[PDB]
Amino acid sequence: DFEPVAIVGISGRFPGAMDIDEFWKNLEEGKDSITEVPKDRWDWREHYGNPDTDVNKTDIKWGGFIDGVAEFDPLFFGISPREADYVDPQQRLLMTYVWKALEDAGCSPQSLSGTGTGIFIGTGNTGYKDLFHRANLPIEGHAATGHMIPSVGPNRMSYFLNIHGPSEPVETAXSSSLVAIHRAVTAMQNGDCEMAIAGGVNTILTEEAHISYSKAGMLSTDGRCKTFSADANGYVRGEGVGMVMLKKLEDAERDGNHIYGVIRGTAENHGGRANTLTSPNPKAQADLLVRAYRQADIDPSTVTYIEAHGTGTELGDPIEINGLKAAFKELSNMRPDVPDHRCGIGSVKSNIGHLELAAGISGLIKVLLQMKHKTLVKSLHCETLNPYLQLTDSPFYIVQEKQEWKSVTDRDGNELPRRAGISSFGIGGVNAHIVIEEYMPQPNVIVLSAKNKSRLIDRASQLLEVIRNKKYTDQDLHRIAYTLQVGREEMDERLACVAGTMQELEEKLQAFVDGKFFRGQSHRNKETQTIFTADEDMALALDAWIRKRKYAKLADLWVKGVSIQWNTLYGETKPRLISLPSYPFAKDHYWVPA
Amino acid sequence: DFEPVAIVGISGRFPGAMDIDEFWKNLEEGKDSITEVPKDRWDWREHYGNPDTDVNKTDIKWGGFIDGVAEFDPLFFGISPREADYVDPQQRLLMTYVWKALEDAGCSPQSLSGTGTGIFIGTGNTGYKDLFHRANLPIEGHAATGHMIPSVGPNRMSYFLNIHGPSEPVETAXSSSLVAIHRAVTAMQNGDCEMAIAGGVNTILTEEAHISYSKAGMLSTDGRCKTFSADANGYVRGEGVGMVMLKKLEDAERDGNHIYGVIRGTAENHGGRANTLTSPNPKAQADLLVRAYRQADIDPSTVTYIEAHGTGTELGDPIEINGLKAAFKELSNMRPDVPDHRCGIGSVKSNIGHLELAAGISGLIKVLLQMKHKTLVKSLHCETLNPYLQLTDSPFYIVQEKQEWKSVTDRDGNELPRRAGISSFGIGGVNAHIVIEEYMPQPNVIVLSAKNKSRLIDRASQLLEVIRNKKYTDQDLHRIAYTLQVGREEMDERLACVAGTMQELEEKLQAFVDGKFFRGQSHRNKETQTIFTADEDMALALDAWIRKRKYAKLADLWVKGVSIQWNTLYGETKPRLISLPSYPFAKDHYWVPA
């Protein structure tokens, strides 16, 4: 054999969280982002009633909603504004956060073009087409690729990125975005592709799903996923989108990627004949886990955290726990390098609700963040545990309070990397499990570019705000410079400044934002580009400009669109890539036509 | 490494074709099954008009429709009649033809229970839910698993069969059921599952798809897929369902399966940045083919037939041909064991239209039948070839007339197995290709059983009609007997008769159908079953009954529900399984409630 996979880039938007940073902020602080259904979507009052006796009524007025579900920047993607009204927000959000995940990795689209890169996204029809019917709008040809065929989403981005790997929507209900990971890893092992992007997108656009699920007995009448609690009585629905970029580990180490964590094993199965169609199967879950850790070949006593599927139902939570206990017990007999095993269990659903198609990727992202800050955040609404869990004689405990994620120790007597598992189960019975292992590893020119002046200003403000918040030190200057130099598409509106410290850079960015560095437009300097064309002695001159570190002169040429081999500023081993703010797309509104 | 996969069972229903037999009948006779839209679905007159100028109108009144899209036998599958109204016909047809494919293989559900068998079906939302909205029906809890979540289809059958392999819907538009094959083969190579069922289901339930596709310029205003023709001007839409059972080749040879053909290589890619989003890419198609045949490791000059994607468009057909020419030319340079290479090209779409989700599986089934009858059937509507094909200096020719499929010869001087390729492309740019290689290999008790008396009579009539039509000889008696003995679920209503020739069997079946053999009900002989319980001396008695070939006595016990070890009637090497009529499900109508 199994070739471990590196997670080298992430992006996302969750309830109460605009980005990954604000998402971790909420988790660490134990925030609950479940709200009442906004009038934006529908009026919960107009559909209120007893679901068991009233026609088309539900008592569920809650959900985890995200901001800007209608926000899109169609011109960035070569889509006209008129056509953007017909494109399903499922696809719009998909394209946006795939790009963001690429930038977060520091992988330039140029580098991707022509490659066998795959895309596997949890997505499906979430009701956008129904809004067209309600509005009594004419059927148009735009609808075909617009919002009638869900696979157009991933396919649209493969077209845009010019990649040739498999491009699939994954739809296995609530396990979708985790099966997507499994499918991606699988595709990388067998040669189908070399790199991959995976994740999920989930949107709640009509009240129909709320009403049917309510009448089927799935939804909590409290509107909270009270996982592991004694009061667990159903789940609460949430919107969201998550993306991860995957590269083979050894490729990621050669290419100088920054790594969030390493996928060591994955597994996918089906529950077979259970009690009913929608009943979970503990035997199937235990077999799932065994296969995953057998493939990872890790001692089960090293796994210190489990992200449970944990939806917050009456008999769902104990069954999952039972599967866990049976799995580890079996893995112990099969092969004891850490005494007194203790493993925490939590569920991100207590914070943001059940993201369904995007549920799996929300779980993974939470775990990756926990590894970064070495903290196990609190699981919500479970002050009183379900008495049927019975964790007394097991390594497991619910993470009821925020705490340090302690690394366990060898029999040889030294620190092991943190290891964790995520589980996602569908109501149809499709189960997926993934095993994550923690990864164990003078002035310059700071360049920025964007499609237009407004976007360029937004890029500068983002870099500014992230610097003021001390998220970087002077130590990270050359990494930030290198990542912007080679890990960003060179767009038309450009900005460059020379800096040696974090303080100098902050001042020159602030000066630019204030409205007072080098500035230019690539398309309006065809004269200059013609002068600095490819010539053999020109190449010597540029090389000397680089060798003698004439940064201000190199920078002024660059903002005019002159190609600079930034690679030669550095020795054999380039600085390792670093996570920087991704593109600030225009927040323009596109929805159902008049 | 590559482990070749055996196709050991098939089933299906296509326009103008109730089953596989009638499907081959149509192909051999060059029948065109495209008809006008039946009043059953919608009134084409009520939506007629100029698509380019008229609101909600289309000039397309044609399509390839199948019979009994509303027919289901819910009690067979443990589904109540009331719930059957809410289950999408996509799922209903799925369950039906998965079972039929299993029976065709001679694989008993008992043998499947507990195994890691996967299910990968081309399916999606085709508009059943929209019929509920039109009818202004109340939202019910049944809808969730009924017709709102497409993955419930495959998952429902995995539940029913008690299998634990991956259970996914595959939706990559028009390449779906071929990607499904690819996904299945892939899952069998990497240990995800040991056996798999793959295929596609496509249904046309509302006029919406017709109108949008028409306004988008996809549909032929002649209503015919005139592939390779000079008159090619779009495709025609068709309904259908196809299923294949897949086993690892060496497992199929050990288990005594009958084999339709061997999958030697598969490939899946994406077209990347093409001319437009929906434009095909010849370079991507050529790379697809190269990978497939490189994996199959077969000399390209041995491939004598290609089932083109062949949709019948203006620039689609030449682009596909160009991809083929470039692919083979490249495969030649890479490594010449048959001089004067000639390879035929055809498209089943000329016969039945474009089955979309089920398009790929229709192509494969056509090819498998062609291998069985050693015949390349006529491609329709192409008396005048597209002048842009340019096949003069290539191995390729359109199969314009029915002809014998000649097997090519070695450089060593002897016959090679027939080899062929199927291609399926999606409008989103997802491409799949599969490489098939032809497979090169005294009275008894005939038992039959079913859920009820009516179904048992139907089973007997099917066996009767297939015997009268000389589809078997006396040579196949022990194979037919063995397949019914071990390759059928033992159901409640039973029928048994002793026979030594095909004539004797036909008479006793006819006698049963006439209303005049052994007969019984398993659930009403608990007394007899108690007497013939498991006892150690009872085992000796039954064994002697088998050894001394007391067939009439064994048969009378069997119809009363007494377990008979039919395995011991035969030596070490059992008779090879044989394709027999599959279950004749009740043709009861279930549709949108009042």
Tab-separated table of N, CA and C in Angstrom, chain B residues 19 22 33 90 97 197 203 247 285 289 321 325 329 335 376 398 407 453 537 562 585:
chain	number	residue	atom	x	y	z
B	19	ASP	N	-36.361	-9.713	-23.948
B	19	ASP	CA	-35.195	-10.321	-23.316
B	19	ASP	C	-33.996	-10.360	-24.267
B	22	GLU	N	-34.684	-12.135	-27.775
B	22	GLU	CA	-35.406	-11.319	-28.743
B	22	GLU	C	-34.554	-10.131	-29.172
B	33	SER	N	-36.054	-0.430	-33.914
B	33	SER	CA	-37.088	-0.456	-32.886
B	33	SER	C	-37.486	0.929	-32.381
B	90	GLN	N	-36.447	3.087	-11.704
B	90	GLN	CA	-35.008	2.888	-11.839
B	90	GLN	C	-34.540	1.794	-10.889
B	97	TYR	N	-33.501	-7.105	-12.781
B	97	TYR	CA	-32.525	-7.602	-13.741
B	97	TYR	C	-31.186	-8.004	-13.131
B	197	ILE	N	-21.662	-7.426	-9.778
B	197	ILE	CA	-22.695	-7.247	-10.782
B	197	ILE	C	-22.605	-5.809	-11.278
B	203	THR	N	-34.530	5.168	-17.928
B	203	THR	CA	-35.962	5.324	-18.144
B	203	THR	C	-36.298	6.754	-18.547
B	247	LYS	N	-16.974	-12.557	-12.555
B	247	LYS	CA	-16.164	-13.352	-11.647
B	247	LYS	C	-14.747	-13.395	-12.191
B	285	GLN	N	-9.320	10.259	-26.469
B	285	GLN	CA	-9.881	8.963	-26.828
B	285	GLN	C	-8.791	7.988	-27.253
B	289	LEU	N	-7.722	4.375	-25.433
B	289	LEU	CA	-7.584	3.101	-26.124
B	289	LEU	C	-6.209	2.470	-25.916
B	321	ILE	N	-13.655	8.045	-34.916
B	321	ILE	CA	-12.859	7.302	-35.887
B	321	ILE	C	-11.399	7.749	-35.868
B	325	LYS	N	-8.016	5.441	-35.175
B	325	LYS	CA	-6.875	5.351	-36.082
B	325	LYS	C	-5.563	5.714	-35.391
B	329	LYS	N	-2.438	3.001	-34.554
B	329	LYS	CA	-1.174	3.387	-35.169
B	329	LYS	C	-0.076	3.485	-34.113
B	335	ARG	N	5.429	-1.859	-30.337
B	335	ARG	CA	5.928	-3.229	-30.316
B	335	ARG	C	6.301	-3.738	-31.708
B	376	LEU	N	-21.210	-10.641	-37.255
B	376	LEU	CA	-21.225	-9.190	-37.127
B	376	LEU	C	-22.480	-8.654	-37.807
B	398	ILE	N	-16.847	0.204	-41.801
B	398	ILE	CA	-18.169	0.140	-41.196
B	398	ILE	C	-18.832	-1.174	-41.587
B	407	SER	N	-12.452	-15.490	-37.627
B	407	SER	CA	-11.344	-15.469	-36.686
B	407	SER	C	-10.030	-15.377	-37.452
B	453	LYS	N	-48.021	-20.738	-7.176
B	453	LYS	CA	-48.468	-21.631	-8.241
B	453	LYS	C	-48.412	-20.975	-9.619
B	537	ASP	N	-28.292	-42.045	10.365
B	537	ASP	CA	-28.653	-43.223	9.575
B	537	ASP	C	-29.576	-42.798	8.443
B	562	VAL	N	-37.562	-31.527	1.459
B	562	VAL	CA	-36.452	-32.275	2.036
B	562	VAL	C	-35.148	-31.983	1.291
B	585	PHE	N	-41.125	-12.811	-13.203
B	585	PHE	CA	-41.769	-11.985	-12.188
B	585	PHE	C	-43.192	-11.608	-12.584
